[PDB]
Design a protein around this nucleic acid. Structure first.
Ligand SMILES: [K+]
Ligand SMILES: [K+]
Ligand SMILES: [K+]
Ligand SMILES: [K+]
Ligand SMILES: [K+]
Ligand SMILES: [K+]
Ligand SMILES: [K+]
Ligand SMILES: [Mg+2]
Ligand SMILES: [Mg+2]
Ligand SMILES: [Mg+2]
Ligand SMILES: [Mg+2]
Ligand SMILES: [Mg+2]
Ligand SMILES: [Mg+2]
Ligand SMILES: [Mg+2]
Ligand SMILES: [Mg+2]
Ligand SMILES: [Mg+2]
Ligand SMILES: [Mg+2]
Ligand SMILES: [Mg+2]
Ligand SMILES: [Mg+2]
Ligand SMILES: [Mg+2]
Ligand SMILES: [Mg+2]
Ligand SMILES: [Mg+2]
Ligand SMILES: [Mg+2]
Ligand SMILES: [Mg+2]
Ligand SMILES: [Mg+2]
Ligand SMILES: [Mg+2]
Ligand SMILES: [Mg+2]
Ligand SMILES: [Mg+2]
Ligand SMILES: [Mg+2]
Ligand SMILES: [Mg+2]
Ligand SMILES: [Mg+2]
Ligand SMILES: [Mg+2]
Ligand SMILES: [Mg+2]
Ligand SMILES: [Mg+2]
Ligand SMILES: [Mg+2]
Ligand SMILES: [Mg+2]
Ligand SMILES: [Mg+2]
Ligand SMILES: [Mg+2]
Ligand SMILES: [Mg+2]
Ligand SMILES: [Mg+2]
Ligand SMILES: [Mg+2]
Lengths: 151, 117, 203, 122, 50
RNA sequence: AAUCCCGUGAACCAUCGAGUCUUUGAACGCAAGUUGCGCCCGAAGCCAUGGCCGAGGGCACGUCUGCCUGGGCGUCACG
RNA sequence: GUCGAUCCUAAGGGUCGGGGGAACCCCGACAGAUAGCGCGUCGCGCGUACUCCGAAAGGGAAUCGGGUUAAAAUUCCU
RNA sequence: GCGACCCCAGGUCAGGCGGGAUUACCCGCUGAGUUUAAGCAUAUCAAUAAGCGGAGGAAAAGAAACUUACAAGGAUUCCCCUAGUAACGGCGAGCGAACCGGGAACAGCCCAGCCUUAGAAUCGGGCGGCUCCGUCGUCCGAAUUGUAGUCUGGAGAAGCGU
């Protein structure tokens, strides 16, 4: 197992990489990545415990006779729909999606739809934001008005 | 760092079985108890001469009984101590045990209690 | 909806992007054994249109099969018979490589049920398929009305009776009418029916 | 006189073991009599004592099994010996609920458009 | 031979037990047709084959 | 055979739902022209936490789900 | 317990993994995270893919007289 | 060094699944020659016997990428007929279906993909309760590289009102 994964890394860089696959090596800079990830942490989806805790605050509210949340959108199927509908303002793509065919076309779609996109390192890092083991890509449909300048 | 060029599988933790249910509901009954081990004494003329000549009792025993279990069966059954046990499998497929009692016990006296003499 | 992009990309197998990815994967598969469990399908879009679902009970295996025809397995290439039967090479197996891959996985994985399979790669010597198998004993499968049909005893070893998608192809069942009529209900059933000498009581 | 099974079932566990011990000892004496030229009447008692031993063992095993089945009643996992035997194929079958599972659209068809009762006028 | 396995010795013991005449009272049963033991074996005439 | 007869009841009776079911065999600790060669758990009993004794049971392979313990710069992030 | 089997390995046999094979089967430690062992008291050290079968003439822990049965003994008795 | 993920390894870890047997019928593969041709090699015997696998009370097939050319039929299977016919064949020996028509039976359907994003609404396992082939609560997992719903061309989505 160790030998195969090391030969796999070598073989990739020995062969000529077509441009559509070579664009994923040009990931977002480390300095800007931290700023982007810091903002994402401010729009994390609610946890399982947090999700249950609000659904009981509503059941009691319903018995005793409200604002749209602003959170990160995840899921390749859902993100692609947002991009096509032109409701996405920023697409974050993981550079290490295997198989790569799942996202090798995303940069072209974002470019054609005039939606800014970035390629960041770590699908596991993206998954941690949305409380998942991994995430192929993230999307921001709208940020809170209090921080629309830095965004 | 590694000082060995040969890779060895690292030691990993192993747990003991803790089944949520027992595979068998209860233990099986003992199929080789004292009565099962000792089927009956041998009352042949050759066997009888060994009662007094050698202080030995000749028994027909279960073929699956070993000398250790025969010794314990005789102790529980007749409450006597054994000097040594010799066993053989007869041509008819049954097992015969030559049981020699210690000098503290008399085979002839025990034989009368059994009811063969 | 991202699966259409993936599916259309896999229709361009001779493009530079696919030729590179397939070249690297083909090398990787050669180094591993002929039957290997894979953590997830290499073609999720292709898998789910053949019945795969991302839920417990569904498993995917990659199967490697050797390419080429079927040399007649006779000692020294000697045939004792008339010239029409003396051929040894240029003979073709009636089942396809896809069927063989399913049978190899099915026999090895006796505790699972073969659902379907699909092509993933090939070289001059080997052909690679992914076989979708179902753990019929898992509760998630048995409680799913769309797949729990495969838990019934009539669906034991579908691949070994030619009942998979690849099985229907090589039996001649993919099609009907004047070009495929002898294949139903089965080729041998048709022969026996047509050979039957019907001797009625009043004849 | 002889052993009555319905009387054994009223005895305690210790009593059955004690009686079983006596029966086995009695049978051992009969075996000795069989090889020492015992009287024909005493050789007929071997069959009776053998029946008694089997009856006592049967009652002991039945009580033991019955108690065990009560201990594991309402438990999810039972020892294999206490699980229903039936046949291999029957045990692997889908449950009654699982066999009747259907998709949502199939459920709606049964409700919206079930088979109707009707007749043709003569 | 003197050197023999346990399994073989057990089989030979059973064959010896089966090599006996039928009990006399068998021929006096009601509706009896057993005249004698039709499977008698002599060590010198027919061999056991094992 | 004071086994059994106005009856918790005879039977080489019928029937089946309780219960028993040796060694093997797909045969599963390893083997086998061997009742051969291993390891683990352990009621009861018994000698002063330990020791002996021991009924009975366990230890094949492939595989699914979950889990525990790990390996590799395989891809990263932070010191 | 003392004679043998049992133990050891020989020519060879049967196999894991891997490679073949529609499959029955073929090759047989050759495509591989070996088996574990040792010393402390669970930890350290070592660690080259079979703890398998294969000899009643090969290798190999230990029994000798005297006596005893209608029939057994370097096995029973002393 | 500490973490996340990926791939892989070990486990007598918790709970499951698989092997073998049977031959009348059924499904897949493999596959002869005797024989016939008055010889014989294509052919025929035969898409058969033998061989290797896999099921069930039936199996297989099955809701048209069909038949047909008509004033059109309408999943599959089976019987009669088509028919010893069209066709195939050292056009020799021989071989040989199908549609229409008449009957037996009759049944239709489920997914994949654009479409929850104001909420993975889905499922498994551990534990507990209950009215226990299931259901409810709770906890831990699976899953966004997509569970459940909606849709399947006969349609359908959306809007409108009967
Ligand atoms: K031939
Ligand atoms: K020919
Ligand atoms: K041995
Ligand atoms: K030797
Ligand atoms: K020598
Ligand atoms: K001596
Ligand atoms: K639950
Ligand atoms: Mg001996
Ligand atoms: Mg999984
Ligand atoms: Mg002779
Ligand atoms: Mg013979
Ligand atoms: Mg065995
Ligand atoms: Mg044995
Ligand atoms: Mg010796
Ligand atoms: Mg050798
Ligand atoms: Mg072999
Ligand atoms: Mg192998
Ligand atoms: Mg080597
Ligand atoms: Mg190694
Ligand atoms: Mg050895
Ligand atoms: Mg040996
Ligand atoms: Mg020697
Ligand atoms: Mg002699
Ligand atoms: Mg376990
Ligand atoms: Mg001729
Ligand atoms: Mg002729
Ligand atoms: Mg000729
Ligand atoms: Mg045949
Ligand atoms: Mg079978
Ligand atoms: Mg059956
Ligand atoms: Mg029928
Ligand atoms: Mg069917
Ligand atoms: Mg249709
Ligand atoms: Mg029709
Ligand atoms: Mg005509
Ligand atoms: Mg023909
Ligand atoms: Mg027809
Ligand atoms: Mg018709
Ligand atoms: Mg969906
Ligand atoms: Mg609708
Ligand atoms: Mg509509």
């Amino acid at each position: 197992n160790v030998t195969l994964q090391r030969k796999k890394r070598i073989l990739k860089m020995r062969l000529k990489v077509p441009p559509a696959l070579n664009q994923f090596t040009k990931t977002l800079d480390k300095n800007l990545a931290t700023t982007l990830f810091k903002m994402l942490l401010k729009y994390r989806p609610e946890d399982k415990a947090a999700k249950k805790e609000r659904l009981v605050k509503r059941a009691q509210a319903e018995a005793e006779g409200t604002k749209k949340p602003i959170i990160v959108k995840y899921g390749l199927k859902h993100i692609t729909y947002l991009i096509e509908q032109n409701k996405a303002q920023l697409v974050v793509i993981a550079h290490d999606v295997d198989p790569i065919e799942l996202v090798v076309w995303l940069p072209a779609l974002c470019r054609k739809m005039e939606i800014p996109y970035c390629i960041v390192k770590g699908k596991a890092r993206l998954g941690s934001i949305v409380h998942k083991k991994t995430a192929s890509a993230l999307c921001l449909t709208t940020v809170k008005n209090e921080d629309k300048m830095e965004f | 760092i590694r000082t060995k060029v040969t890779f060895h599988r690292p030691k990993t933790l192993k747990k003991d079985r803790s089944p949520k249910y027992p595979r068998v509901s209860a233990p099986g009954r003992n199929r080789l108890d004292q009565y099962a081990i000792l089927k009956y004494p041998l009352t042949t003329e050759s066997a009888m001469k060994k009662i007094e000549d050698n202080n030995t009792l000749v028994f027909i025993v279960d073929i699956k009984a070993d000398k250790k279990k025969i010794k314990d069966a005789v102790k529980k059954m007749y409450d006597i101590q054994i000097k040594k046990v010799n066993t053989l499998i007869r041509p008819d497929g049954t097992k015969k045990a030559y049981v020699r009692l210690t000098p503290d016990y008399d085979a002839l006296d025990v034989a009368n209690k059994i009811g063969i003499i | 909806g991202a699966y259409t992009y993936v599916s259309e990309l896999w229709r361009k197998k001779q493009s530079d992007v696919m030729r590179f990815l397939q070249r690297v994967r083909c090398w990787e598969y050669r180094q591993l054994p002929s039957i290997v469990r894979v953590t997830r399908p290499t073609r999720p879009d292709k898998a789910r249109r053949l019945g795969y679902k991302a839920k417990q009970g569904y498993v995917v295996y990659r199967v490697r099969v050797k390419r080429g025809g079927r040399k007649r397995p006779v000692s020294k290439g000697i045939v004792y018979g008339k010239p029409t039967n003396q051929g040894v090479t240029q003979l073709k197996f009636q089942r396809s490589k896809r069927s063989v891959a399913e049978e190899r996985a099915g026999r090895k994985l006796g505790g699972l049920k073969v659902l379907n399979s699909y092509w993933i790669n090939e070289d001059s010597t080997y052909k690679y398929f992914e076989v979708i198998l179902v753990d019929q004993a898992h509760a998630a499968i048995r409680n799913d009305p769309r797949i729990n049909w495969i838990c019934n005893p009539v669906h034991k070893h579908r691949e070994l009776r030619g009942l998979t998608s690849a099985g229907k192809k090589y039996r001649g069942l993919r099609g009907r009418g004047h070009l495929h009529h002898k294949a139903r209900p089965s080729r041998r059933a048709t022969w026996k029916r047509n050979q039957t000498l019907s001797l009625r009581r009043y004849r | 006189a002889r052993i009555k099974v319905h009387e054994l079932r009223n005895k305690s566990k210790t009593e059955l073991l004690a009686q079983l011990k006596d029966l086995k000892a009695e049978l051992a004496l009969l075996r000795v009599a069989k090889v020492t030229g015992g009287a024909p009447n005493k050789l007929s008692k071997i069959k009776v004592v053998r029946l008694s031993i089997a009856q006592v063992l049967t009652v002991i095993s039945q009580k033991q099994k019955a108690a065990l089945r009560e201990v594991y009643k309402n438990k999810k996992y039972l020892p294999l010996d206490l699980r229903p035997k039936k046949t291999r194929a029957i045990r692997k079958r889908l449950t009654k609920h699982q066999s009747s599972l259907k998709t949502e659209r199939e459920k709606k068809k049964e409700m919206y458009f079930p088979l109707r009762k009707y007749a043709i006028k003569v | 031979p003197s050197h023999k396995s346990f399994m073989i010795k057990k089989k030979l013991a059973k064959k010896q037990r089966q090599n006996r005449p039928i009990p006399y009272w068998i021929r006096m049963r009601t509706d009896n047709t057993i005249r004698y033991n039709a499977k008698r074996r002599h060590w010198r005439r027919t061999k056991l084959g094992f």
